[PDB]
Amino acid sequence: KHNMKAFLDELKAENIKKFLYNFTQIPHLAGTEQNFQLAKQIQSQWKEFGLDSVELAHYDVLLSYPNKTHPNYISIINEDGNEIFNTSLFEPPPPGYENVSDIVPPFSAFSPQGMPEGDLVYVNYARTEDFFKLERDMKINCSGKIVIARYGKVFRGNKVKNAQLAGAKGVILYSDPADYFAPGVKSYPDGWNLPGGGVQRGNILNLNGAGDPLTPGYPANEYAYRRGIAEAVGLPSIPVHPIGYYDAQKLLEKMGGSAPPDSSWRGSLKVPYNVGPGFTGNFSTQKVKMHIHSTNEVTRIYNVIGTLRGAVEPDRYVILGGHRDSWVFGGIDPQSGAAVVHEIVRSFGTLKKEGWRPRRTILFASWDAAEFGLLGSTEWAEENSRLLQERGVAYINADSSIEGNYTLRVDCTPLMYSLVHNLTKELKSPDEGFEGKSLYESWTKKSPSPEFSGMPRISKLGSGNDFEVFFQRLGIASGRARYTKNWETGYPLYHSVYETYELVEKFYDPMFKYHLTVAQVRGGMVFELANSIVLPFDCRDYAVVLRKYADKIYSISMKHPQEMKTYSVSFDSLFSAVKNFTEIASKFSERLQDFSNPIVLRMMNDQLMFLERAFIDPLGLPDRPFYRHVIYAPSSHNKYAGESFPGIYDALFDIESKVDPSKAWGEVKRQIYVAAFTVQAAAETLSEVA
Amino acid sequence: KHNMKAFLDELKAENIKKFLYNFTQIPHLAGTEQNFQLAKQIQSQWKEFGLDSVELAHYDVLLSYPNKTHPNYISIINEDGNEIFNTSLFEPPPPGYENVSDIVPPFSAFSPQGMPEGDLVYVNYARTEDFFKLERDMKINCSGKIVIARYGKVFRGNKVKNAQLAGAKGVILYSDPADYFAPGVKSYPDGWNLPGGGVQRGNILNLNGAGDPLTPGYPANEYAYRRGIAEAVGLPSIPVHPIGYYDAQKLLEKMGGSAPPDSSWRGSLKVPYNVGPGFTGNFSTQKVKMHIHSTNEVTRIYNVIGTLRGAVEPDRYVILGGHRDSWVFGGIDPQSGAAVVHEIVRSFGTLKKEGWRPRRTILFASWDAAEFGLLGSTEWAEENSRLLQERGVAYINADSSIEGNYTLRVDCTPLMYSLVHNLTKELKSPDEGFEGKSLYESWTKKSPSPEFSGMPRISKLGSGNDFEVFFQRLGIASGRARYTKNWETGYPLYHSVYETYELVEKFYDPMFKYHLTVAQVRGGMVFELANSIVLPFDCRDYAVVLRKYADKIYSISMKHPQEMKTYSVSFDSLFSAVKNFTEIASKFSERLQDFSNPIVLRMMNDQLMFLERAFIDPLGLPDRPFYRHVIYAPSSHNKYAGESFPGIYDALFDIESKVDPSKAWGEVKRQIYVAAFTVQAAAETLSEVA
Ligand SMILES: *[C@@H]1O[C@H](CO)[C@@H](O[C@@H]2O[C@H](CO)[C@@H](O[C@@H]3O[C@H](CO)[C@@H](O)[C@H](O[C@H]4O[C@H](CO)[C@@H](O)[C@H](O)[C@@H]4O)[C@@H]3O)[C@H](O)[C@H]2NC(C)=O)[C@H](O)[C@H]1NC(C)=O
Ligand SMILES: *[C@@H]1O[C@H](CO)[C@@H](O[C@@H]2O[C@H](CO)[C@@H](O[C@@H]3O[C@H](CO)[C@@H](O)[C@H](O[C@H]4O[C@H](CO)[C@@H](O)[C@H](O)[C@@H]4O)[C@@H]3O)[C@H](O)[C@H]2NC(C)=O)[C@H](O)[C@H]1NC(C)=O
Ligand SMILES: *[C@@H]1O[C@H](CO)[C@@H](O[C@@H]2O[C@H](CO)[C@@H](O)[C@H](O)[C@H]2NC(C)=O)[C@H](O)[C@H]1NC(C)=O
Ligand SMILES: *[C@@H]1O[C@H](CO)[C@@H](O[C@@H]2O[C@H](CO)[C@@H](O)[C@H](O)[C@H]2NC(C)=O)[C@H](O)[C@H]1NC(C)=O
Ligand SMILES: *[C@@H]1O[C@H](CO)[C@@H](O[C@@H]2O[C@H](CO)[C@@H](O)[C@H](O)[C@H]2NC(C)=O)[C@H](O)[C@H]1NC(C)=O
Ligand SMILES: *[C@@H]1O[C@H](CO)[C@@H](O[C@@H]2O[C@H](CO)[C@@H](O)[C@H](O)[C@H]2NC(C)=O)[C@H](O)[C@H]1NC(C)=O
Ligand SMILES: *[C@@H]1O[C@H](CO)[C@@H](O[C@@H]2O[C@H](CO)[C@@H](O)[C@H](O)[C@H]2NC(C)=O)[C@H](O)[C@H]1NC(C)=O
Ligand SMILES: *[C@@H]1O[C@H](CO)[C@@H](O[C@@H]2O[C@H](CO)[C@@H](O)[C@H](O)[C@H]2NC(C)=O)[C@H](O)[C@H]1NC(C)=O
Ligand SMILES: CCCCCCC[C@H](NC(=O)[C@H](CC(=O)O)NC(C)=O)C(=O)O
Ligand SMILES: CCCCCCC[C@H](NC(=O)[C@H](CC(=O)O)NC(C)=O)C(=O)O
Ligand SMILES: *[C@@H]1O[C@H](CO)[C@@H](O)[C@H](O)[C@H]1NC(C)=O
Ligand SMILES: *[C@@H]1O[C@H](CO)[C@@H](O)[C@H](O)[C@H]1NC(C)=O
Ligand SMILES: *[C@@H]1O[C@H](CO)[C@@H](O)[C@H](O)[C@H]1NC(C)=O
Ligand SMILES: *[C@@H]1O[C@H](CO)[C@@H](O)[C@H](O)[C@H]1NC(C)=O
Ligand SMILES: *[C@@H]1O[C@H](CO)[C@@H](O)[C@H](O)[C@H]1NC(C)=O
Ligand SMILES: *[C@@H]1O[C@H](CO)[C@@H](O)[C@H](O)[C@H]1NC(C)=O
Ligand SMILES: [Ca+2]
Ligand SMILES: [Ca+2]
Ligand SMILES: [Cl-]
Ligand SMILES: [Cl-]
Ligand SMILES: [Zn+2]
Ligand SMILES: [Zn+2]
Ligand SMILES: [Zn+2]
Ligand SMILES: [Zn+2]
C-alpha cells in the first residue's frame, strides 16, 4: 500500500544527517555563487528524486554586503581623535574552518553608511516599553545619541525602528550573556553556548511584508521598474552594527549618568548597566564612533520550485517551502530545515516511482534571500499571486527543524489544529522517558495548553519567516513545526559563524531523531493536506479561538471604562459576528460529515480552502497594505510574534497618550466594525451556497 | 424539452408592457416609501414566479434631497439686490400627471448649500479639453466665477470636478437644444423631444467606484462606523443646479467678454455663446445668484435579491441585475429594464415549476439608489465580495432596455464576444426591412465593426451603471445590451419628469418588440452562462483586443519620440506579454475543445471564470483604490466611457505639461511594467495547472 505510513516509514534519520553535512561545508550567503551552485544541485537532485518538473525562479532584488576592503568597526574615540579601542573585524572561526574562504564578517544588513560620533545611551532591549520607561519615567533624551541595545525579546528591526523614532543617530546591537549564555553549558566548540567573540548577524529592515524594497507589489523580474533608494521600502536611516559581549563589555564599562531603573535592565556582564547618556567623569570626554561602509546592491537570487502533479485535483496546491540562504554555514538556520525538506522530497519521490501520486499537487520550494527580508518567497508569491489565491490549499514552512531538544513547537492557523493533534497521536515520541509513547503525549506533557486540560500549546503566526506572504498577505492556511527548548528553565549561536554541522551533530541531535520526528510532522501534514478526500481543516476550531481573541481585545478596551462610556464604544457587533460564526461553522461541520457527490465534496473543499482567504481585507491594515489578515498580523512591536485583532489592538495601544481622544476612540470603533464585518463575512462563506 | 428555445419562447412583449405600466404610475425615488413599497411588491412577485428565495438586503447610505419648504433656484441679481429673473421651481408636469404628488423638482444630488453671487463664464461642455482651451489658449480665468455649462458628451460629475479645479464658485448645468432637441421631432407630449421647461436631474458625485460616500470598502450595515461629512468620498465642494433651455436662454443672452473660439462652442439658442466673464456693458453690473438648500441625509435603501439554485453547480453564480429607483416615473430609466428583468424571472420560473433548474445558480437583483451613485449594487457587493470573487461567473446588467429604436448596442468583456455573436445569430431581428433575418444580420449592417468585415460593433465597459463594482472592482466578467439610436444621424428626455410610460408606448416601442428583443438577448446570455456545460467564454477574443489596446497605447506614447529616447521608454515587455497571452490562450482553447471528466471540466471552467479576475490589481489604480481592473477603467475624464490600459493612459495624459519630465516618464515606465506583468500573470492562469 501507498498510504501515509508508507511515506513516513521511508524517511530516515541517516539521510537527513547526510544531507545536513552536504549543505553546511561552505557558506551559502544570498546572492553569492556558492548559493547559486547549491540551488543547481538541489534542482538536479529533486529531479533525480522523481519530481515532475523542477525549475529555478530568479529575481533581481536589493541585497546588502560589507565592503571587502573597508571593513565595518566601532571605536572609542578620545579627545584628540585617537581610536583607543576597536571592535573585532571578524569572529574567530571554529576549529577546522579557520581557512574557509568567504565568511561574511558580522554586519547589520541594509545599514546605511556613516561615521557618527557620540555618547551612548543604554536602552535595555530597545522595546517600545523600554523607550517609554526612558523618556516618560526617567526623562532621558535619546536625540543625537548612539544607543546601545542588547538583542533578545523582539525582532531586531523593531529595535532599530524604535531607536530611530526616539531620535538616535546610531545603534550598536550586542549579545548579552544574560540572553545568550545558558548557565552551566560550555561555549562553542565545547558546548552550544555563545563565546565572547560570537556575533549575531541579521537584517534590520522594517518592510511590513513588502518583500524587495524596490518593487513592492510586483515581482522583481527582468523588466521591473524599481523605486529609487530614497523611496525604497523599509530601509533604516541610521547606521547599525552588531558586536559580541567581549566588545560590548569594553563599551559599557565606562557608562555614567542614571542607574538602571531596576534589575530587568541589568544583564550578566560585570558592568553597572548605567543608562547614560555618556561615560563617567574620568572619561567624560571620550565618545563612541561607528564606521559603516556596507553597500546595497541589486543582486540575482534563485528559488528552486519542484512540482509533484496531483492525480485528481492538480489545480489545488499544497506547498512545503523553506529557505536555503544562510548567513554563514547555516548548521541550524536553515540547513536543518532544508535537509528535512530534501528527505521529504526523496520519500514522496520513492512513492511516485512506484506509481503513486498525491490527490492534489504538491509544490516544494527552496527559497533564496530569506535572511534579507523573506525576499525569495515574497517575490515568487507576488509573481504567482493569482494562482495561489485561487488554488492554494496550504503552506507548510520548513526553516530550522531544531532550536532545542526539549519538545515540539507548532505555530499554525486554527484550521490545522485538529490535523496536528491527530497526526502527533500517530507518531512515536523521540523523547527520553517517553519511549513507546506518542509524540502527542510527550508534547502535551511538556508544553501544556494554557486553556485546556490534556491538550498541547499551539502558537499564532506572525512574521520572521517565509510563511508570511502566504498567510498574512494572501490568506492561505499556513503552519510550522520544529523541536524547541524548555522555556520554563533565538538559541545562543543564532546567526553566528558557530552554527555548524558539528554544533548539531555533537550538541543538539546526535542521532538525528529530533530531525526525523520533525520530518514526520511536516511531511505528515503535507501528505494529509495533499491526499485526504475532504481537506483536513476544522472550521469549529477557528470559532473557539475567535471568541478567545474577542474576549481578550474587549478586556484591553475595558481598561478605559470612562472613554467607552463617553464615545459609546461597543463590542456587541464583534461578539455577534463570533456567535454567528460559531453557529454557522457548527452547521457546516454537520453537512460535511453527512453529505458519492464529488461536486458537493469539492464545493465543500472550496468552502474549506477559501475560509482562511475570507479573513483577508483587500484594503490591508492601516499604513500596512501588505498585511491583510484581519485576525492575525505580525505585532507592530515585534515582527516575530502574532497579534490577534491587530487593527483594534493597534488602535487601543497607548491610547491614553493620544492628543485627540475623540478621534482615537473613533478609530477604535472603526476597527471594531471592520473586524465584526470580516468575521461575519467569513462565517457567511460557510453558509449553504444557494 | 427545457432548453434555451423554451425559455425564449415564453417571454412575451405584452407582459413587458403590463409590467412597465405597473412600475411607472408613481415616482420611485431612492429612499422614499413608494420605492420601498415597490421593492416589497417585486419581492412578492418573484416568489410567486417561482424563485427559491427572495430577500430584501437593506443599507443606510448618504442620499440628498431638496428642502420641501425652501426651494432651489437661480437669480439674475441687479445692482440693488433685486432678483429680476428666477428660474423655474419645477418642470410643468405631463398631461394627466399634473396632480401626482411627490415629484422631486430638478436638482443636482449631493450639491452643498450656498448662495454664491457672481459673473458667468460659459465653458462649453466643461470637458477637460474645454477648460484647456479657456485657460491655455484664450487666457480666461475661471477663479471666483459661476460657470455655466451645457450637458452632453461626458458624465456630469466630471464636468463639476473640472469646474472645481478651475477655481469656480458654482456651476449651472443646462440642456442645450443642440444636444437634446432632435431636428424635425415634436417636444413632449407630442413627440420625444425635450421641451424648454424640461430639466435633466442627476448626481454630481465623483466617487471613483467607492459606493456610499460614508463607508468606502465596507457595507453600510446597522453597525457601520461612518466617516464625517468632511471626510466623505466624492462630495462636490461648490453649489450646482440644473435648468432647462428656456431658463438658460435668459441667463446666456447677456453674456459679454470673449467670442466663442469656434462653432463647436455654439449651441442652438439664439444667443452669442460668448464665453464671458460677465454680461455686456448695459448689464455689466448685474450678477447671477444661486440659491441651493438641499440636504444630505443617511437614508435606508433596499435591494431585492432573488435566487434560483443551480442543479449541478449551485456555488457558481450568474447574476442579472438592474436598478429600480428612478428620478421621477422612470419610464425608460430604469423601468424599461426592470420590466424586462421581471419577465425574464417569470420565464425562468415557468421552467422551474415544470421541474427544470439551471446548471449554475442564477441571482436576480433589483438594485436601489443607483441614481445616487450606484449605492445599492456597490454596498451589496461590498457585503458579499468574498462570495462573489470566488463564485461569480458573470454579471449581466439590466438598466434601460431602450434609448432609441435603431439597432442593438452591446458593451461587454471580450470574454463574451463569441457568446453574443452566437446568440444574436439565433434571434429574430425586430427591425423594419429585416423581417425573417437574424438580429446579428441587422445589428452588423447598422452598427458595423470598425476593424472587421461582417462583424458588429461591441463597446468597452466603464462606469455609470451597476455593473461597475462587479467588473471594475471585483473582476467578474460583465456585459450589457440595449436598443439604441442611430449615432450617424442620453436621449432628449433623460432624467426629466417627461420619462413616462406614454413616452415609451407612443414614441419608442409601441409593440414592445424592441423590449422583447432585449429580453431575449439579456435572458439568452443569462441562460447560456448558467446552463452551458463549458462556460461560454473565449479567451482568444481577449488576446485579439489586448494587441489592439497595446498598439493604441504605444501610438499615444509615440507622439513624444524624443522623450522615449531620453528616458528609455520601451513597450517591449507589454508586447511580449500580449504575445504570450495569445500563444497560451490558443493552447488552452485546444485543450478545452479536446479534453467525461468533470474535474478537468470544472478545473477548466475555473480557469475560464478566474481569467477576468486575473486582470485585477489588489493595489488598484493610482489614487483610485476601487478601480482595480488593469485593462479597463472608467475614463478619468468621462465616467461613462471605458478606457483601455488606464494606468498607462493617465500617466501619458497631457505629459508635455508636467514640470518634472523625468518623474513623469518614470511613472509611464512604471505603468508599462504593471500592465505587462498583469497580462503575463493572466496568461499564466490559462497554462496547464501543474
Ligand atoms: C448575526 O446573525 C443575525 C441573524 O441571525 C443577524 O441579525 C440581523 O441583525 C440586524 C441588526 O443588526 C437586523 O436588522 C434589523 O432588520 C430589520 C428588518 O429585518 C430592521 O427593521 C431593523 O432596523 C430597525 O431597528 C434598528 C435597531 O433598533 C434601527 O436602527 C433602525 O433604524 C430600524 O428602526 C434592523 O435593521 C436583521 O434583521 C437581523 N437579521 C436576521 C435576524 O435574520 C446579525 O446581524 C448577525 N451579526 C452580524 C455582526 O452581522
Ligand atoms: C513571454 O514568455 C517568454 C517564455 O517563452 C518569457 O521569456 C523569458 O524571458 C526572460 C527575459 O525577460 C528570460 O530571462 C533570462 O533568463 C536567463 C536564465 O534562463 C538569464 O540568464 C537572463 O539574464 C541574463 O541576460 C539578461 C538580458 O540581457 C541580463 O539582464 C541579465 O543580467 C543576465 O545576464 C534572463 O534573465 C527567460 O529565460 C525567458 N524564459 C523562457 C525563454 O522560458 C518572457 O519573459 C515572457 N514575457 C513576459 C512579459 O513575461
Ligand atoms: C553534496 O552532494 C552532491 C550530490 O551528491 C555532490 O555533488 C556531486 O559531486 C560529484 C562528485 O564531485 C559529481 O560527480 C556530481 O555531478 C555532483 N552532483 C550534483 C551536483 O547533483 C556534492 O559534491 C556534495 N557536496 C559536499 C560538500 O559534499
Ligand atoms: C583601531 O583601528 C584604526 C584603523 O586601522 C587604527 O588607527 C590607524 O592606525 C594606523 C597604524 O598606526 C595609522 O596608519 C592610521 O593613521 C590610524 N587611523 C586612525 C587613528 O584613524 C587604531 O590605532 C586602532 N586602535 C587600536 C587600539 O588598535
Ligand atoms: C481527527 O480525528 C478525529 C477522530 O477520528 C476525527 O473526528 C471524527 O471524524 C469522523 C469522520 O467525519 C466522524 O465520524 C467522527 O464522529 C469524528 N469523531 C470525533 C469528532 O470525535 C476528526 O475529523 C479528525 N480531524 C481531521 C481529520 O482533521
Ligand atoms: C402593480 O401590480 C401589482 C401586482 O399585481 C399590484 O399589487 C396588487 O394589488 C392588488 C389589488 O390592489 C392586491 O390585492 C395585491 O395584494 C397586490 N399584490 C402585490 C403587491 O404583490 C399593484 O396594484 C399594481 N400597481 C399599479 C399602479 O397598477
Ligand atoms: C424671484 O423670487 C424671489 C423670492 O421669492 C422674489 O423676491 C421676493 O418677493 C417677495 C414678494 O414681493 C418679497 O416678499 C421678498 O422680500 C422677495 N425676496 C427677495 C427680493 O429676495 C423675486 O421678486 C422673484 N423675482 C421675480 C421676477 O419673480
Ligand atoms: C459559437 O459558435 C461557434 C460555431 O459553432 C463555436 O465554435 C465551434 O465550437 C465547437 C465545439 O467546441 C468546435 O467543435 C468547432 O470547431 C467550433 N467552430 C468554429 C470555431 O468555427 C463556438 O464555440 C461558440 N462560442 C461559444 C459557445 O461561446
Ligand atoms: C521581513 C521580516 C523578517 C526579516 C527577514 C529575516 C528573517 C530572519 N528569520 C530568522 O532568522 C528565523 C526566525 C524564526 O522564525 O525563528 N530563524 C529561524 C531559525 O527560523 C531574521 O529574524 O533575521
Ligand atoms: C457612480 C458613477 C455613476 C453615477 C451614479 C448615477 C448613474 C446614472 N446612470 C444613468 O443615468 C444611466 C447611464 C447609462 O449607463 O446609460 N442611464 C441609463 C438610461 O442607463 C447617471 O448617469 O446619473
Ligand atoms: C569599498 O571600499 C573601497 C576602499 O576601501 C572603495 O574604493 C570602494 O569604492 C568601496 N566599494 C564599494 C563602495 O562597493
Ligand atoms: C533632545 O536633545 C536635543 C539637543 O541636541 C534637542 O534638540 C531635542 O529637542 C531634545 N529632545 C527633547 C528635549 O525632547
Ligand atoms: C539536549 O538535551 C539534554 C538533556 O536534557 C541537555 O543536556 C542538552 O543541553 C540538550 N541540548 C541542547 C542544545 O539543548
Ligand atoms: C428646510 O427649510 C426650512 C425653511 O424653509 C428650514 O426651517 C429647515 O431647517 C430646512 N430643512 C432641512 C434643513 O432639513
Ligand atoms: C483668477 O482671478 C483671481 C482674482 O480674484 C486671482 O486671485 C487668481 O489667482 C486668478 N488666477 C490666475 C490668474 O491664474
Ligand atoms: C422609431 O423609429 C422611427 C423610424 O425610423 C422614427 O421615426 C422614430 O423617431 C423612432 N423613435 C425614436 C424615439 O427614436
Ligand atoms: Ca516585489
Ligand atoms: Ca460602503
Ligand atoms: Cl519553520
Ligand atoms: Cl444596461
Ligand atoms: Zn532561517
Ligand atoms: Zn535566520
Ligand atoms: Zn438607470
Ligand atoms: Zn439614470
UniProtKB/Swiss-Prot annotation, chains A, B:
Altering D333 to E/L: what's the impact? Complete loss of activity
The EC number(s) attached to this protein equal 3.4.17.21
**Activity regulation remarks:** The NAALADase activity is inhibited by beta-NAAG, quisqualic acid, 2-(phosphonomethyl) pentanedioic acid (PMPA) and EDTA. Activated by cobalt.
Cofactor(s) the protein requires to work: Zn(2+)
Tissue expression pattern: Highly expressed in prostate epithelium. Detected in urinary bladder, kidney, testis, ovary, fallopian tube, breast, adrenal gland, liver, esophagus, stomach, small intestine, colon and brain (at protein level). Detected in the small intestine, brain, kidney, liver, spleen, colon, trachea, spinal cord and the capillary endothelium of a variety of tumors. Expressed specifically in jejunum brush border membranes. In the brain, highly expressed in the ventral striatum and brain stem. Also expressed in fetal liver and kidney. Isoform PSMA' is the most abundant form in normal prostate.
Q: What residues does Ca(2+) bind to?
A: T215, Y218, E379, E382
The alphabetized list of GO BP terms reads: C-terminal protein deglutamylation; folic acid-containing compound metabolic process; proteolysis
User: Which reaction is the catalytic activity of this chain?
Assistant: Release of an unsubstituted, C-terminal glutamyl residue, typically from Ac-Asp-Glu or folylpoly-gamma-glutamates
- Describe the processing and modification events after translation: The first two amino acids at the N-terminus of isoform PSMA' appear to be cleaved by limited proteolysis.
Pfam families per UniProt? PA, Peptidase_M28, TFR_dimer
* Extra information: PSMA is used as a diagnostic and prognostic indicator of prostate cancer, and as a possible marker for various neurological disorders such as schizophrenia, Alzheimer disease and Huntington disease.
Stated name of the protein: Glutamate carboxypeptidase 2
Q: Which organism is it from?
A: Homo sapiens
